[PDB]
């Protein structure tokens, strides 16, 4: 009888649409849309309304494509505007009087744009209720598939990867501390540009129209975390048949077909997270000193719950060994900041040793989808919703705070 | 212009008498400064309100004080259309009143839009090019206005023209 | 109790649906470990 | 300056800032913030930075107060920064041959006053130390033998009444809100607006804005219908890195849990009823005395507007529960609220009257050799 | 980080802040007889294609800094070995290359100038210069053993991708 | 995006994900989607007790019983046929679709699934144009409730076949945006001459629609399409009903669509006028 | 303490400015003598406004200015026009100054 | 004619020393920088911070070379060079509302500041425990007294303010100041008795500027009413108005016996006379432009004149003066070359 | 001395200065 909610999430490569209830999102597009060519204003007639987005806007001739969200903030409202329209009454195919919307936030955000994306969708598609819930809390939400019955608490650290720059983001009790909220600029296009410089450098035969898709795919398809990069540079080199593989594509043009040699960059890709000086010549940190130094800006008495529960989330975090090696460079890091505090001490300072878990599931490439469409298939999800009502009688000024609990 | 020119002469020319304020602190809280027009605690501090009339419908309203100025326009709404979009015209801008520094949230009560302007505002601006800006955006919303109707009809015949056709 | 309790409650039972659902070249482990 | 040519110090030990000057001026010489850092980057310039330089690069070190409600936490950083006060750097003097006065808050142990005697006898080796209590200075400083003194600091605001210049100690009383919870809430009422700041990194970023803009409102119903309205509460603030933050209605709302503490949590009553009730748990032939004189202190009665919310809140109460039907007699009554623009330093002003007039009497002094051959009974001259 | 050398020894001969490490070679020069299967060259060789692609190194002792001369001459010797078609081309290409004069520490053209430390008297910098050419023969020889594929005696393309870059961003030669 | 569209899409890319991957050879996995379309039209598709060689697609629509009194189940078993099976629980039209027995050309199976909505909207067109066509008259009018409170009212006259409509507006700013658009309907024979005609009533029912329930109040507005034996003849008529039963969200998408073009150009006005008023600073631009 | 204070139509125009209410407290006196002065000014002719206008001392032309700014208070039918054009001609002879006092009034007229 | 654009914000009072060597201004905050000519070329010497409030005064003594300042922290201080360093001292002022006015007597042993608590404090010296204490002079002033000047005989005071009225009092202390003669204003003078209060019947603005004259016998003021006014107490204490076409002048001076220059939200100071049988005249204005969207007014300030003070010698000898304007720029104009430049314009 | 002596006249003399409002606190000299 009821009809379900709509889960709309969007980032800046891909924007993830579908109904509450469900485990997986029905549409994974990409975040772009092809607008009609400039040539040169005033649009007469419905000119406004020729335009593709997803999979259509990219390569359609006598098209410009765009892209409205930059590092996570919509840039553009008219673009998003008539984003959301396509998505709305093309792809969903739902009524928006009669549905309630969830949608999601950066983690640094302003109030303005709450108060900019409430004004869109109360009064360009006069939908009953709107919830805009931060990503945090529904990527912890949805790490407690894998977790039992007792370990299911809202105290943890998430760390965010996908297209874009890196969050680490603590939050404790469900109340996200915004004091210690850190990112590092290393993400999935860098990994994408770094395998398209080694492909440049070493191979030949590629399309030069082509480069960037087929670094994508055997980023996609190949690649995997090392735990030492001399003893696999010589894994390589001793037994070459093994490892080297061979990848093969059909050109767009002349439609035959190249084969080329997957070599290094099956290790040496992921391998910028940890050594960000490979490819970015600004930033030398690592992950896990970034994590370490968020974790020690937190107060003394949650310190001890947010290194028990480390929660990945994102696309960029579905390389193999990713949790073991993050897990491993903290141990060593806070190993070595006890073992200075007991020499400091002089037999003063005698700790505990704490307790590292990075914690890896199933549902790690859709984490925030899963935890809005759970959050949203309860019945209890109706009644912290801003209405129309109160839009209409208070004002814009009820989108700016939100009800977490 | 059949009766525009002379309207907005002497809306300009009451406008110019009006913006002549200084500093002036409070006298019944100590170190709070406060504008005059809106708080009314001291009747010494304030002038007369005077009004400009073009017809029955459009008119300015201006009220003065030592440190702060008040002005209310009433907008020319011919048909039903005109009414709504003037509306929501006029609930566009005061939601974004914090980058504007001189438009009030909530209208005064038989008008549509209001400024209030401080003596920090004559103090950071010249005073004339503020007096040419209230011109210029009583000239320039008429001229949307008119220009939303005209894109709306037309929008609205090529929509059913198309449905009308591929049948 | 709130939006809380129920989302355990729908977690806990979507948790043993996932895990009926999931019912050899990287297999060394010694080079992990410190 | 005394006869025999030996300076008169005075200094007075804040929790949040020491104010340092001499004897017969009307102006503090150093005013410098009172904590001492270390480099928590060992941890992840110089091992010991003391002073208001400790306070500038705050977020590069781990910082302490040695100092809290003039009670000594930690023994060495208080000396480490009272060596930075008698040093080259802010009052250049040789400590052998000075005078001193310190001051004191009500309320305090005797231990503490005992060994902040024992050193100042053993370590730097004065030649006469004296201690004071702050609310009889106060009083001092604006010509008054008899009054009700309200000091709100950065510790614990209290409420103390002076009869004929000695403390009545079973009448004093004390509220758990100063300007430190003020930042803090300030903090949690700016992180609603999206603006986040540390709690500890970025403390004075959040202090310079409470000092430049907040304020008390004197009808709390007449400010957010300006709030409502208008735009004329909302001011840019520059931060020091070069981001422009804008403060709207939070303005009045911080220093309004000085007056309702159920805000920030904490029980009892405002500052205006805690008064009242301090006033009339006196005796009845001395309750007039004691409304005809009331001086406010200290630095966190700094806010604009104060003194005619509280003298109207006064007003109020006097009016419902004492006279209760009439409005006539209220006019006979004479409630006054002295707020000089000076009152920030009432204190330092206060023993620098106190150690010009009896500069030259021994008898007020006392000297190195009788804490010589008598040791902790020195302090007995005291009182 | 990156990798360091493990070949210290509390009683080695400090030339200048560098050490005078033993090799294994039938060249002629200044430099110890070594017994043992592993001397700095092989170690060299070994973090050749790890270290390259580092750019913020740090000196922990004495032997870094052969490690490091070595390892941008490797780069070098990628450099003049990429155009080359038959081994035994190779070996009289690097025959040319090894008795070039390089610039030694101290005189510019050396980039690492402010690491590493100049020589002071006269046969200091002839045993340094003489140390120098036999590193440079010894790890010419030994290049050319792995790079050369010997089925097809082409170079192999796993070893020329390296030839675009640079340790430190720093070049043993002109640009 | 000028019309709407008549084929489903997550019920098209699903089936063709699972026809590819099962005549690709791989094992097939399993499926479980609930979702909704246009009129509270609730769609189902699963693995039936447990199956995951066989997919199952079921629809639910509230008023079943008015497009079963009509006869929608002899057009759902003529154009699907075989793929017809039992109802399940809590859902109207189920269909079963098979992994291992399927055909060679799996294209119009497809677009025949995507279109099970329609397929159950055209029972009644298809009944009241062969009434017209076949030259009775004085049957009963069709009242359907295809909203909660919006009705559809069909009539088949001697020489013609009426449809009227009735939608109500929620917002009082869309009343005026839908009178100027059924003012630009209304006189729209003028440029196309072969066309049904459009009248439009707001307030009030018709006269022809009398001893009903017909609304009252200020909100409702009366649509009337008049079809000529032109537009339902035999080869025309599923154009015909593919341009009637999307009519009423074609106009409040477009409705939706002219209210955020007007938001556009209020944007690009609020920032001129910011951009006029900063100029007015002294040496501080 | 409040504050408290303490064919001739040019000579029909001559006797209209002529013998206002000065001090008196009753409103009709006042509502009559606006009503007289503004039936005067708005059935007046449209191309001899300007010597109407320059046949004025300093304060005939600031209780025109007074009386033309209570005209635009009541507006009915074509009159705003005539009182703008009455404005103009003022304003072309008496300055922004007499804007000012008409501003800067404790006593209404 | 000269002019200079010290700042970009606006100049609330300035002042200058004996010689017009050095300068001192507030630049719209809470501090006074004190500006050094060196050669042709204006740089900035001293800086002086110690009030928390807006600045609303400024004044330079020019025998004993000391600044009083006063803002709207209800405070004030006076500040005097030792070593080659600024100084300041308190005063007690007992005011519970903001300063607007501050001047210094002509014999520089009091100074008056005017404030919003509707009273006038007049301060003077103690130094057995070295402050400055003041006296109040409370009835019957109603509002906030907006400026003041000083007689020529150390004791009589002008104020107007914001309750439409101009009035004299006689500011006599007997502590500091000898036993004066009679004057055309009164012969009774105790402390606070007011001599005469001139203003309207009915209509009236709120005085912004009053100036004594030369020889102390006429007074003028300007109102917001766009009107100029002369008193002459020797004619059985007269009044002549004039009002003007122009918006309201928010400053005056006597540059003679018989002239007086007004600047305001104009842009351009005016020159008005007065002759002997008391007919006040406007002659002329000082700025006409040379004969010859970015607006570009055709005045040489482009925002309003809040100062007029006299640039050359005195009262009784006028050759120049100086203007300070709310767009952050000084200008000093000269008589003998506005004679030449402009036909008709005599100066008597 | 001690507490009370030339203390009080110099909190009299500080009365006086700081503290006239109260020689105004309610609400032949001059012949030529
Ligand atoms: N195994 C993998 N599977 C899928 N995507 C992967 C995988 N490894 C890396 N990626 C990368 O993940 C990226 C997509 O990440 P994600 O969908 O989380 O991005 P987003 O839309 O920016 O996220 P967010 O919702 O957090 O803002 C792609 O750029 C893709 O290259
Ligand atoms: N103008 C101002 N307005 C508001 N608060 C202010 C102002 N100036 C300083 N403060 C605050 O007042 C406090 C300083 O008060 P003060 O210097 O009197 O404290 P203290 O002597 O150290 O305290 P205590 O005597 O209780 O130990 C700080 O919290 C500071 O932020
Ligand atoms: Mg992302
Ligand atoms: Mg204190």
């Not at chain 1, 890091?333 to 505990?352: F, H, N, Q």
């Not at chain 4, 009439?326 to 204190?347: A, G, W, Y």
């Not at chain 8, 914001?162 to 009164?186: H, L, M, N, Q």
């Not at chain 8, 007086?260 to 008005?272: N, R």
């Given at each position: 009888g009821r009809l379900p909610a709509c889960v709309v999430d969007c980032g800046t490569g891909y924007t993830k649409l579908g109904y509450a209830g469900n485990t997986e999102p029905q549409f994974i597009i990409p975040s772009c849309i092809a607008i009609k060519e400039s040539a040169k204003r005033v649009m007469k007639g419905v000119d406004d309304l020729d335009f593709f987005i997803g999979d259509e806007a990219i390569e359609k001739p006598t098209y410009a494509t765009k892209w409205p969200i930059r590092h996570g903030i919509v840039e553009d409202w008219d673009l998003m505007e008539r984003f959301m329209e396509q998505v709305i009454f093309k792809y969903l195919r739902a009524e928006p009087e009669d549905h309630y919307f969830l949608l999601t936030e950066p983690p640094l955000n302003t109030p303005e744009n709450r108060e900019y994306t409430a004004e869109i969708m109360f009064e360009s598609f006069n939908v009953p209720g709107l919830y805009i819930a931060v990503q945090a809390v529904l990527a912890l939400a949805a790490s407690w598939t894998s977790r039992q019955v007792g370990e299911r608490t809202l105290t943890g650290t998430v760390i965010d990867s996908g297209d874009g720059v890196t969050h680490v983001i603590p939050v404790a009790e469900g109340y996200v501390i915004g004091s210690c909220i850190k990112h590092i600029p290393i993400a999935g296009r860098d990994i994408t540009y770094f395998i398209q410089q080694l492909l440049r450098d070493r191979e030949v035969g590629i399309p030069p129209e082509q480069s960037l898709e087929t670094a994508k795919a055997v980023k996609e398809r190949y690649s995997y975390v090392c735990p030492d990069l001399v003893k696999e540079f010589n894994k390589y080199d001793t037994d070459g048949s093994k490892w080297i593989k061979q990848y093969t594509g059909i050109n767009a043009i002349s439609k035959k077909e190249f084969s080329i040699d997957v070599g290094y960059e099956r290790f040496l890709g992921p391998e910028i997270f940890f050594h960000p000086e490979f490819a970015n010549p600004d930033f030398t940190q690592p992950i896990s000193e970034v994590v370490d130094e968020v974790i020690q800006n937190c107060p003394i008495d949650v310190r001890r719950p947010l290194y028990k529960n480390i929660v990945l989330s994102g696309g960029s975090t579905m390389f193999r060994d990713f949790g073991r090696r993050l897990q491993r460079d903290l141990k060593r890091?806070?190993?070595?900041?006890?073992?200075?505090?007991?020499?400091?001490?002089?037999?003063?300072?005698?700790?505990?040793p704490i307790d590292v878990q990075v914690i890896t599931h199933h549902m790690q490439r859709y984490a925030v989808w899963f935890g809005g469409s759970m959050l949203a298939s309860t019945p209890e999800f109706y009644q912290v919703c801003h209405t129309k009502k109160d839009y209409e009688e208070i004002g814009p000024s009820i989108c700016r705070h939100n009800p977490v609990f | 212009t059949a009766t525009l020119r002379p309207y907005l002469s002497a809306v300009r020319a009451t406008l110019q008498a009006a913006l002549c304020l200084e500093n002036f602190s409070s006298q019944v809280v100590e170190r709070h400064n406060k504008p005059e027009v809106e708080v009314r605690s001291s009747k010494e501090l304030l002038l007369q309100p005077v009004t400009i009339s073009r017809n029955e419908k459009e008119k300015v309203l201006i009220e003065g004080s030592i440190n702060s100025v008040r002005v209310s326009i009433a907008v020319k709404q011919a048909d039903e259309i005109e009414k709504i979009l003037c509306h929501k015209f006029m609930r566009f801008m005061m939601m974004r009143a914090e980058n504007f520094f001189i438009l009030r949230r909530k209208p005064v009560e038989g008008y549509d839009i209001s400024f209030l302007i401080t003596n920090f505002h004559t103090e950071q601006m010249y005073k004339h090019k503020l007096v040419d800006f209230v011109i210029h955006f009583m000239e320039e919303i008429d001229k949307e206005i008119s220009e939303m109707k005209l894109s709306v009809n037309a929008r609205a015949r090529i929509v059913a023209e198309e449905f009308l056709k591929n049948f | 109790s709130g939006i809380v309790g129920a989302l355990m409650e729908v977690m806990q039972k979507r948790s043993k649906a996932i895990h009926s659902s999931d019912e050899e070249d990287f297999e060394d482990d010694d080079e992990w470990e410190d | 300056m005394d006869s025999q040519g030996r300076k008169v110090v005075v200094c007075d030990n804040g929790t949040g800032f020491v104010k340092c000057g001499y004897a017969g001026s009307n102006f503090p010489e150093h005013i410098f913030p009172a904590l001492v850092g270390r480099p928590i980057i060992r941890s992840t310039i110089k091992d010991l930075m003391v002073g208001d330089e400790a306070s500038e690069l705050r977020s590069m070190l781990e910082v302490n107060y040695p100092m809290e409600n003039g009670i000594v936490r930690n023994w060495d950083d208080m000396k480490h920064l009272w060596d930075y006060t008698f040093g080259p750097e802010k009052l250049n003097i040789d400590t052998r041959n000075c005078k001193i006065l310190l001051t004191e808050p009500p309320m305090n142990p005797t231990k503490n006053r005992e060994k902040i005697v024992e050193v100042m006898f053993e370590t730097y080796q004065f030649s006469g130390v004296y201690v004071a209590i702050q609310a009889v200075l106060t009083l001092y400083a604006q010509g008054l033998l008899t009054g009700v003194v309200v000091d709100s600091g950065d510790g614990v605001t209290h409420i103390c009444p002076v009869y004929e210049g000695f403390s009545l100690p079973h009448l004093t009383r004390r509220l758990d809100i100063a300007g430190r919870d003020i930042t803090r809430y300030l903090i949690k009422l700016l992180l609603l607006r999206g603006y986040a700041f540390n709690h500890s990194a970025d403390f004075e970023t959040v202090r310079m804005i409470k000092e430049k803009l907040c304020y008390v409102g004197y009808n709390i119903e007449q400010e957010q219908k300006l709030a409502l309205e208008t735009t004329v509460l909302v001011e840019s603030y520059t931060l020091p890195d070069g981001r422009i933050i804008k403060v709207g209605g939070e303005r009045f709302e911080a220093p309004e849990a000085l007056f309702q503490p159920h805000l920030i949590n904490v029980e009892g009553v405002g500052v205006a009823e805690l008064l009242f009730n301090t006033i009339q748990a006196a005796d009845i032939d001395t309750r007039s005395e004691f409304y005809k004189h009331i001086v406010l202190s200290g630095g966190s009665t700094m806010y604009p507007g104060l003194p005619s919310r509280l003298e109207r809140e006064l007003k109020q109460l006097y009016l419902e529960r004492?006279?209760?039907?009439?409005?006539?007699?209220?006019?006979?009554?004479?409630?006054?609220?002295?707020?000089?623009?000076?009152?920030?330093?009432?204190?330092?002003?206060?023993?620098?009257?106190?150690?010009?007039?009896?500069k030259d009497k021994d008898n007020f002094w006392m000297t190195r050799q009788e804490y010589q051959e008598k040791g902790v009974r020195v302090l007995e001259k005291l009182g | 980080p990156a990798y360091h050398s493990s070949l210290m020894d509390p009683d080695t001969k400090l030339i200048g802040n560098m050490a005078l490490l033993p090799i294994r070679s039938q060249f002629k020069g200044p430099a110890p007889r070594?017994?043992?299967?592993?001397?700095?060259?092989?170690?060299?060789?070994?973090?050749?294609?790890?270290?390259?692609?580092?750019?913020?190194?740090?000196?922990?002792?004495?032997?870094?800094?052969?490690?490091?001369?070595?390892?941008?001459?490797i780069s070098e010797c990628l450099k003049k070995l990429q155009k080359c078609n038959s081994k035994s081309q190779g070996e009289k290409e690097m025959y040319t290359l090894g008795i070039t004069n390089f610039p030694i520490p101290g005189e510019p053209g050396f980039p690492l100038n402010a690491i590493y430390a100049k020589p002071a008297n006269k046969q200091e910098d002839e045993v340094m210069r003489a140390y120098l050419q036999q590193l440079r023969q010894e790890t010419g020889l030994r290049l050319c053993e792995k790079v050369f594929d010997p089925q097809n005696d082409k170079p192999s393309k796993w070893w020329t991708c390296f030839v675009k870059r640079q340790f430190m961003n720093k070049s043993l030669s002109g640009p | 995006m000028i019309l709407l569209e008549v084929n489903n899409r997550i019920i098209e890319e699903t089936l063709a994900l699972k026809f590819e991957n099962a005549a690709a050879g791989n094992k097939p996995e399993a499926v479980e989607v609930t979702f909704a379309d246009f009129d509270g039209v609730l769609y189902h598709i699963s693995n039936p007790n447990g199956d995951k060689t066989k997919v199952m697609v079921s629809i639910s629509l509230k008023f079943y019983k008015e497009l079963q009194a009509h006869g929608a189940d002899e057009l759902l078993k003529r154009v699907y046929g075989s793929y017809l099976v039992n109802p399940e629980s809590g859902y109207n039209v189920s269909l079963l679709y098979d992994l291992e027995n399927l055909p060679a050309s799996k294209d119009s199976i497809v677009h025949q699934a995507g279109m099970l909505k329609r397929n159950c909207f055209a029972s009644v067109f298809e009944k009241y144009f062969q009434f017209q066509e076949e030259g009775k008259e004085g049957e009963n009018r069709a009242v359907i409730h295809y909203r909660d409170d919006e009705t559809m009212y069909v009539e088949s006259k001697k020489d013609r076949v009426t449809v009227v409509f009735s939608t109500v507006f929620k917002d009082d700013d869309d009343v005026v945006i839908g009178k100027v658009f059924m003012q630009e309907f209304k006189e729209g024979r003028r440029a196309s001459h072969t066309a049904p005609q459009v009248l439009f009533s707001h307030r009030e029912p018709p006269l022809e629609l009398k001893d009903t329930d017909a609304a009252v109040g200020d909100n409702i507005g009366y649509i009337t399409f008049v079809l000529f034996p032109r537009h339902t003849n035999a080869s025309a008529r599923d154009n015909t009903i593919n341009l009637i039963h999307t009519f009423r969200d074609y106009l409040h998408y477009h409705i939706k669509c002219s209210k955020a073009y007007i938001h556009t150009r209020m944007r690009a006005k609020t920032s001129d006028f910011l951009k006029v008023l900063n100029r007015a600073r002294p040496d501080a631009e | 303490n409040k504050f408290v204070d303490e064919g001739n139509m040019t000579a029909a125009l001559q006797a209209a400015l002529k013998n206002p209410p000065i001090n008196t407290k009753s409103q009709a006196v006042k509502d009559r003598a606006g009503s007289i002065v503004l039936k005067v000014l708005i059935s007046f002719k449209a191309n001899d406004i300007e010597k109407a206008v320059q046949s004025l001392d300093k304060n005939g032309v600031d209780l025109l200015m007074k009386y033309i700014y209570k005209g635009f208070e009541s507006p009915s039918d074509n009159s705003s026009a005539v009182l703008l054009q009455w404005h103009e001609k003022a304003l072309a002879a008496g300055g922004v100054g007499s804007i000012v006092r008409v501003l800067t009034a404790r006593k209404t007229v | 004619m000269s002019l200079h654009q010290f700042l970009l914000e606006p100049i609330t009072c300035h002042a200058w020393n004996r010689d017009r060597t050095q300068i001192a201004l507030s630049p719209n905050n809470h501090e006074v920088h004190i500006y050094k000519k060196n050669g042709g070329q204006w740089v900035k010497a001293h800086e002086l911070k110690e009030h928390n409030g807006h600045i609303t005064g400024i004044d330079w003594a020019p025998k004993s070379d000391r600044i009083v300042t006063c803002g709207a922290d209800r405070n004030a201080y006076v500040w005097s060079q030792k070593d080659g360093v600024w100084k300041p001292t308190l005063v007690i002022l007992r005011i519970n509302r903001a300063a607007t006015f501050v001047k210094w007597s002509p014999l520089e042993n009091k100074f008056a500041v005017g404030s919003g608590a509707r009273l006038i404090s007049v301060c003077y010296f103690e130094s057995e425990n070295d402050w400055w204490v003041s006296k109040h002079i409370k009835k019957p002033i109603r509002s906030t007294v907006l400026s003041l000047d000083w007689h020529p005989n150390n004791v009589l005071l002008?104020?107007?303010?914001?309750?439409?009225?101009?009035?004299?009092?006689?500011?006599?202390?007997?502590?500091?100041?000898?036993?004066?003669?009679?004057?055309?204003?009164?012969?009774?003078?105790?402390?606070?008795?007011?001599?005469?209060?001139?203003?309207?019947?009915?209509?009236?603005?709120?005085?912004?500027?009053?100036?004594?004259?030369?020889?102390?016998?006429?007074?003028?003021?300007?109102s917001?009413?766009?009107?100029?006014?002369?008193?002459?107490?020797?004619?059985?204490?007269?009044?002549?108005?004039?009002?003007?076409?122009?918006?309201?002048?928010?400053?005056?001076?006597?540059?003679?016996?018989?002239?007086?220059?007004?600047?305001?939200?104009?842009?351009?100071?005016?020159?008005?006379?007065?002759?002997?049988?008391?007919?006040?005249?406007?002659?002329?204005?000082?700025?006409?432009?040379?004969?010859?969207?970015?607006?570009?007014?055709?005045?040489?300030?482009?925002?309003?004149?809040?100062?007029?003070?006299?640039?050359?010698?005195?009262?009784?000898?006028?050759?120049?003066?100086?203007?300070?304007?709310?767009?952050?720029?000084?200008?000093?104009?000269?008589?003998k070359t506005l004679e030449s430049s402009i036909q008709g314009l005599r100066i008597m």
């Open positions: 890091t806070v190993d070595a900041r006890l073992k200075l505090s007991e020499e400091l001490s002089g037999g003063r300072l005698k700790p505990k | - | - | 004492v006279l209760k039907g009439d409005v006539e007699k209220l006019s006979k009554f004479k409630i006054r609220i002295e707020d000089p623009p000076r009152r920030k330093h009432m204190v330092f002003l206060g023993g620098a009257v106190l150690a010009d007039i009896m | 070594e017994t043992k299967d592993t001397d700095i060259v092989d170690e060299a060789i070994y973090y050749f294609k790890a270290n390259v692609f580092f750019k913020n190194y740090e000196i922990k002792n004495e032997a870094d800094r052969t490690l490091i001369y070595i390892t941008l001459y | - | - | 002008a104020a107007g303010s914001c309750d439409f009225k101009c009035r004299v009092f006689s500011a006599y202390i007997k502590e500091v100041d000898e036993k004066p003669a009679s004057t055309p204003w009164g012969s009774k003078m105790p402390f606070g008795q007011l001599m005469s209060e001139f203003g309207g019947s009915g209509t009236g603005g709120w005085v912004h500027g009053v100036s004594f004259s030369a020889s102390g016998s006429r007074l003028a003021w300007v917001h009413d766009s009107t100029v006014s002369v008193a002459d107490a020797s004619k059985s204490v007269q009044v002549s108005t004039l009002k003007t076409e122009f918006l309201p002048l928010l400053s005056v001076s006597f540059v003679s016996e018989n002239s007086v220059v007004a600047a305001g939200h104009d842009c351009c100071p005016m020159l008005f006379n007065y002759d002997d049988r008391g007919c006040l005249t406007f002659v002329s204005k000082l700025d006409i432009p040379k004969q010859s969207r970015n607006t570009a007014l055709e005045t040489l300030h482009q925002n309003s004149i809040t100062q007029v003070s006299i640039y050359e010698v005195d009262k009784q000898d006028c050759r120049k003066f100086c203007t300070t304007g709310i767009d952050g720029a000084m200008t000093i104009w000269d008589f």
